[PDB]
Amino acid sequence: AKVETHEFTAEISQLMSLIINTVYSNKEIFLRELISNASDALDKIRYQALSDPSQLESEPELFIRIIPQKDQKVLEIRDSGIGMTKADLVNNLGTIAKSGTKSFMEALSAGADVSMIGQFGVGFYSLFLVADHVQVISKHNDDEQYVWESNAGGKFTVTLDETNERLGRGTMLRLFLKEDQLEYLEEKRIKEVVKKHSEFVAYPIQLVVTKEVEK
Ligand SMILES: Nc1nc2sc(C(=O)NC3CCN(C[C@@](O)(Cn4cncn4)c4ccc(F)cc4F)CC3)cc2n(-c2ccc3c(c2)N(c2ccccc2)CCO3)c1=O
């Protein structure tokens, strides 16, 4: 019931420093990668639910939700997919992620762009193009809610979630944007990116916008 600190394998840590310092334009592709991961997670609970339709009871709705938090300079990406267990918060960044990270690093050395990260299965880490820090909140039907946190360094933490909204089921990525990357808190900006790169998504992409009620 405490804060469990871990170290990244050199491969994961290696990719994060590259992306976070990268001065590459076209930073906007991070959102395509995260939406694709959200859709994959929803595919899995929808598939699991096809036989046992009661795995959906923890959150009956299947959605992708984007929440700008302007005062916090935070952007949240939430899904009601299958979710990740505490085991996964420390054992979903390995195996498929161990291979995909190391081979992607070698492709980058050969000349590959960060736009290709997704075809190596590690598109998650493209968030560091725009964020210098991230928390990942997740809730799997067969486990409690947990929080994963990293600031692109070799160390990340995992903590039982006693402070965030209850997800019901699924995952929410909390991106702490950089000061030069705050454009991605704006409704018009998010619409453009989603419509350009995420046209073929089987689930509703909901955008939560906060607006002052005018005179
Ligand atoms: N929004 C996101 N949502 C989802 S859901 C998800 C996922 O992989 N799997 C769930 C969990 C359980 N598994 C296995 C199984 O069923 C197998 N089993 C054992 N027994 C019987 N069956 C099972 C069941 C119950 C159980 F207790 C244990 C188990 F193993 C299948 C369904 C990944 C993501 N990612 C994501 C995508 C790509 C990524 C990452 C994150 N990275 C990441 C990872 C962690 C933290 C930070 C970043 C990094 C780079 O790449 C999202 O962004």
Q: Which run of H or of E encompasses 137?
A: strand 131-139
Q: Quick check: is 14 in a domain?
A: yes
Ligand-binding site membership of 70 (annotated): no
* Token reading at 23: 């001065």
* CB contact at 8 A, 138 and 146: yes
Residue of 9, 12, 33, 88 to mutate, ligand 1, most atoms within 8 A of C-beta: 88
Ligand-binding site membership of 98 (annotated): yes
What residue numbers bound the domain in which 104 lies? 3-207
Establish whether residue 78 lines the binding site of ligand 1, counting it when its CB lies within 6 angstroms of any ligand atom: no
Q: Quick check: is 212 in a domain?
A: no
Establish whether residue 12 lines the binding site of ligand 1, counting it when its CB lies within 6 angstroms of any ligand atom: no
Experimental approach was X-ray
* CB contact at 8 A, 38 and 171: yes
Establish whether residue 77 lines the binding site of ligand 1, counting it when its CB lies within 6 angstroms of any ligand atom: no
Q: Quick check: is 59 in a domain?
A: yes
- The phi and psi torsions of 180 (rounded to 5 degrees) equal -90, -5
- In the chain the first and final C-alpha atoms are separated, in Å, by 48
* Token reading at 56: 């959906």
To what resolution in angstroms was this structure determined? 2.1
CA distance 120 to 62: 26
Q: In this structure, what CATH number is given to the domain that contains residue 69?
A: 3.30.565.10
What domain count does the chain have?
Answer: 1
Q: Quick check: is 77 in a domain?
A: yes
Establish whether residue 207 lines the binding site of ligand 1, counting it when its CB lies within 6 angstroms of any ligand atom: no
- The phi and psi torsions of 147 (rounded to 5 degrees) equal -130, 130
